[model samples]
Target chain A: MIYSITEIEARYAETDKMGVIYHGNYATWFEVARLDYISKLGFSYADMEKQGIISPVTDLNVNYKKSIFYPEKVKVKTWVEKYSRLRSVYKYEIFNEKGELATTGSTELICIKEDTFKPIRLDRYFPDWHEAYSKVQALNNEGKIVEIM
Target chain B: MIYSITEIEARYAETDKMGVIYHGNYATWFEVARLDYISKLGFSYADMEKQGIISPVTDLNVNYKKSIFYPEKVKVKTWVEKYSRLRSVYKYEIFNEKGELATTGSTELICIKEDTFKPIRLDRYFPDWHEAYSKVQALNNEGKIVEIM
Candidate 1:
């Protein structure tokens, strides 16, 4: 149930004319958080691609509560909200250095075979990977791991 | 070559843990520039989608020369590098307020019919679009728009 937190600084390039972070750029921040979480699990996206597996996002939802301006430091917290046979859902919370909430979101990803470009359940190919996810999923279900905020 | 410049202020949300802009966020900036350019041409993405046409990126290239921090005002200079029957290419240059180059990149997009999702030559659908693109192509062919530092 340990949620992983990764910090990121805002770049001027991500801002709009308003000097605020553009709405669409948040998706990339979600990715940075996801990559951090997966890396902690001892698997990197590079590793997965080498195994002929690609996880593509099927659905994404983001709610912007407050706008973020450049020169502010933000923290991206990511957790495994759900992990099933074929689908993995990750939740994110972004906060400024002053502990103010900036945005909240989640993304759903599905695994596909790189060669066939078809869907494949992770459990079938890697049972150990499945087991690891299941352990976390159980904790999440029991409300012992990461909880919805 | 008429490059459209869009000015933007860096927002707090764009910073990474390092308090600098994430490298990948530049892609979204490129989209904003492209959107503005298309709008100038009297076309909107929403309208194009309603017409059953979608432009999807096939390739992208970006080079980061410097990092942009929050609160900095930056400008994105975008221009059409090429436009042909099947694809359109756009180039971008991002500069900080002091006129220092931050990044330069390009993206290639292919138009597909909304219903079939198959490639369609842009000129076939809108002759005016093709004509406008040809002017840019002519300038590039003449080496009038050289590499910018």
Candidate 2:
């Protein structure tokens, strides 16, 4: 499934004494982007977690091409890069107002049953959701994913 | 001049709903590294600001190469990378216990007069500080800066 864009302003608290946005804050941005994407896909991250299925990042990678400062508008473009029975990966590209490449990265997550904290296959639990992801996966296999990273 | 290394723990609160360390939390790590570097230089960030000199980041960048999960120890290597009349740049490398590079980045700051918030030359405010920076800058120019970055 396709995802929409999520825009946010870099807050003062998001920056360090150097006035440049701090590196760790990007992970939070990843969350915001992921939440936005999933919500657009008709599910909320918070609600999903409450359903006893927690998706935790098993891997994360980011490349910083430019610095983003406070009061800057960053456009986060996110899409599902990979979706499997037990894992889902989302890719992101963060750009400044000038449309300059600020940062790019991807996060991989695994669905685990909250009660036992054990792995859960999305296709088995939610077959229709898996079918929707299948279409997206086919498109991704065709290399339609954006080149944010 | 080179500064000492800073040790910091990965706090539980630093993690997000994903269970892995939040990306934005890296900014806080940068603060910890900065705090250690400044404290070693006999000038704390808070003390400098209280002295009417506010060093704010003009730019910041980082590349995340790996995911750091909870209950893991992280070492942030910070040092002065560049020192000019009005700006100071600090470099950082965060590593996991296995000596693997987790994240690499830098932050640039300008010294602004606290009252006016106008930029000030470090040489004019503190000659010794400028001298120390000059020595380091010379070494940096000679390619003596740490390779951790």
Leading candidate by TM-score: 1
Model 1 stretches astray by more than 4 angstroms = A145-149, B1-149
DockQ of each: 0.06, 0.02
Instruction: Give the lowest summed-lDDT range of ten residues in model 1 chain B.
Output: B140-149
**For model 1, what is the C-alpha lDDT against the true structure?**
0.83
Tens-digit lDDT string for candidate 1 (B1-149)? 55677777876666665567767778888998888877765567887788788999999999999889888999998888777788888999999878999999999999898877889988887677778678767876776753222
Question: Residue-wise lDDT of candidate 1 within A68-91, one digit each (tens)?
Answer: 988788999899888899899999
Query: How much lDDT does each candidate structure score?
Result: 0.83, 0.79
True contacts kept of each: 0.00, 0.00
Error of 2 at B119 (Å): 52
Model 2: per-residue lDDT, tens digit, A1-149?
36558898997666654447778889899999888876776666787766677888899898999989878998998888778888888889998989988899999988888889888889887777688778778877886744322
Give the CAPRI rating of model 2: incorrect
Candidate 2 per-residue lDDT, tens place, B12-99, comes to 6566544567788787789778877776666557766777888887888988999887678878888777778888889888988787
Worst 10 residues of 2 chain A by lDDT: A140-149
| Candidate 2, number of clashes | 11
Total backbone collisions for each predicted model: 25, 11
lDDT assessment of candidate 2: 0.79
